[PDB]
Amino acid sequence: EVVLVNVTENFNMWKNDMVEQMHEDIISLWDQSLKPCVKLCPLCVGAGSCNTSVITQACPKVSFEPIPIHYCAPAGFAILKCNNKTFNGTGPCTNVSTVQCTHGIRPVVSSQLLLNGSLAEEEVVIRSVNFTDNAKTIIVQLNTSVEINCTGAGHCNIARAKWNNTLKQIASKLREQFGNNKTIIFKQSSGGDPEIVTHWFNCGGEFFYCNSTQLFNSTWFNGSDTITLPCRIKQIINMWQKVCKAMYAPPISGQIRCSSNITGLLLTRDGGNSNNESEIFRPGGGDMRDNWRSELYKYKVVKI
C-alpha cells in the first residue's frame, strides 16, 4: 500500500508470529465448524498410567467451504510487506511497504499439495529453513496452477502433461539449489500416518485420502492423458489440530465434487550419507503452519 523508500527490512518466514496466530485461528474455526461424533485425546503423567479423554456429541453433516481471511494490524503493531517478486522469505528485503491488511488467504487444510493459494509471480520458488537439513520441509510455490478434480466416487484427476511440465520446473529449481550435476528423483511418501502418506484434504465436508504415488514417481536430468489418483473417504481420522483421533458420520451426498488448483507443494529430501549424485524428494506436510507460511512468508508484524 505505502512503499517505504530506501528501507531495508529483515524477514524470517520460519519465525513469524502471524503464522502462529493464523494457526490458532484455524484451529478455533474447525473446532466450532466440524464437530466429530467422537473425539479421543490422550492424557498422561501422574500416578503412572495414561488416560484417554473421550467426547461424544451430535455431528451434523456440513459442507465445508473455506472463506478468505484478511489479517490486519493488531493494536500497537504494523504489518510490513516484502514487494520483491522473488523473495525466499529469509533475509533482507530491499523493497518493503506498510500495509493495512494481508491479501485474502483461504485457510485450506491439506497435506502434500497446497491448494487454492497464491502463485509465484515470476519463476517457481522453493523455500526451506535449512536446505542442507533433510528433515526440514521444502515449501514449493508454483508459478502456474494445476487443476486437480476429485469425486466422492473415489478418485482425483490431474492432467498428465500439465503435471509433468510442473515437475520439470520444480526439478530444475531443486538442482539449482542442490547441484547442477544432480539427478532429481521424485518418490512416494516413505511412510507415517495416512493423512501424511496420502494427499489428504477435505471436500464437501468429507476427508479424502488420495494415493499420490503416480504424482511422485519420476527421474529428471538423468503415459495416459489423465493421471487418476485412487482415493478413499474415511470416517476415522488423525486430527491435525492436536494429537487426537476423531470419528465422523459416513457421507450423505452421492455427488461430492471438488475442483481445486494446485499452487504449491510440501516436499522433503531423503538426503543421508551418499556419494551418489542424485537427490530424492517425497511429498510431505502435516504441520499446517507450513501451509500458512506458504502465504504469509512475505509479511511480518512490527512494533510501532
Epitope: 461424533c37 467422537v38 479421543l40 484417554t52 473421550v54 461424544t56 456429541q57 451430535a58 455431528c59 495416512p194 485420502y209 478413499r232 474415511k234 470416517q235 476415522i236 481420522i237 483421533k245 470419528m247 458420520a249 459416513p250
Partner: antibody
C-alpha cells in the same frame, strides 16, 4: 461373519455385580461393533449399550448410565458386560450382539446401529 | 427418548396368508429402522435394516417399507417357521440411545 459365544448362567444376590463375557470368532474383531441387549422374562428387548471396538469407546442407555460398563479385549476377541448394584429387576437373559462396520482398520466406519450377529444369551438371575 | 410402538400386540393369521405388522416412532428416525424375528428360547434374528433392506439369509417373502415415523413389515405368505414375535428397533439418534418396540406376536389362526 462372526460367531458369538457367551459365558454361562449367573445367580446373584441383589446388590452384587455381575460380569458376563462374549467370545467373537470367525472374522476380524476390530471391524465389528458390539452391543448388549437384555430381555426380562415375558418382556421385550432392551438396548443396554454398544462399544465401538476399534476405538474402545462405549455408549450406554440413559436408564443404566452409571452402573453399566462394556469393555473389549482385542487380544482374546472377547467383549464384556459389567452390571453393578444389581436389582431383582435386573433378572433377564443378556444377549451379546454385533455388526460389521466396514474396513475399520483403514478408517472406514459405517456406525451401524442394527444387529446382525447374536450370542446364545446368558441368564442372570438376581434374587435374595 | 424415542418411543417405538408396534401394533397390533397380537396378530392371528391363517397359514399361507399375508401378514402386515406396524411400527410407529414418537419422532422421525428417518430410515434407521430394523426388524427382528424371535422364537421362544432363541436370540432375535435380524430380518430388515435401513427400513427396507433384507439381511442375508432372509427370504424374499419378508418386506420392509416406510420412513420417518411410520414403518411396516409385510410377510407375503406365512410359512410355519414365520410364526414368532417380531420387534422393531430405531437407531437414528446420536449419542446412541437406541430403542425397541414392545413386539408383535404373530400366531397361527385356526
Amino acid at each position: 461373519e462372526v460367531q458369538l459365544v457367551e459365558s454361562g448362567a449367573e445367580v446373584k444376590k441383589p446388590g452384587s455385580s455381575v460380569k458376563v463375557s462374549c467370545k467373537a470368532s470367525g472374522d476380524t474383531f476390530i471391524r465389528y461393533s458390539f452391543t448388549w441387549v437384555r430381555q426380562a422374562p415375558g418382556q421385550g428387548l432392551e438396548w443396554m449399550g454398544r462399544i465401538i471396538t476399534i476405538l474402545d469407546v462405549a455408549h450406554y442407555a440413559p436408564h443404566l448410565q452409571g452402573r453399566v460398563t462394556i469393555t473389549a479385549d482385542k487380544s482374546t476377541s472377547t467383549v464384556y458386560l459389567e452390571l453393578r448394584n444389581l436389582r431383582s429387576d435386573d433378572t433377564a437373559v443378556y444377549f451379546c450382539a454385533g455388526v460389521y462396520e466396514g474396513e475399520a482398520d483403514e478408517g472406514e466406519y459405517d456406525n451401524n446401529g442394527f444387529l446382525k450377529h447374536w450370542g446364545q444369551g446368558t441368564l442372570v438371575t438376581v434374587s435374595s | 427418548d424415542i418411543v417405538m410402538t408396534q401394533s397390533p400386540a397380537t396378530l392371528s393369521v391363517s397359514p399361507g396368508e399375508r401378514a402386515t405388522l406396524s411400527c410407529r416412532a414418537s419422532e422421525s428416525v428417518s430410515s434407521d429402522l430394523a426388524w427382528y424375528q424371535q422364537k421362544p428360547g432363541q436370540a432375535p434374528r435380524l430380518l430388515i435394516y435401513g427400513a427396507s433392506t433384507r439381511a442375508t439369509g432372509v427370504p424374499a417373502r419378508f418386506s420392509g417399507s416406510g420412513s420417518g415415523a411410520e414403518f411396516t413389515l409385510t410377510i407375503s405368505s406365512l410359512q410355519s417357521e414365520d410364526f414368532a414375535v417380531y420387534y422393531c428397533q430405531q437407531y437414528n439418534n446420536w449419542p446412541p440411545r437406541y430403542t425397541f418396540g414392545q413386539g408383535t406376536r404373530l400366531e397361527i389362526k385356526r
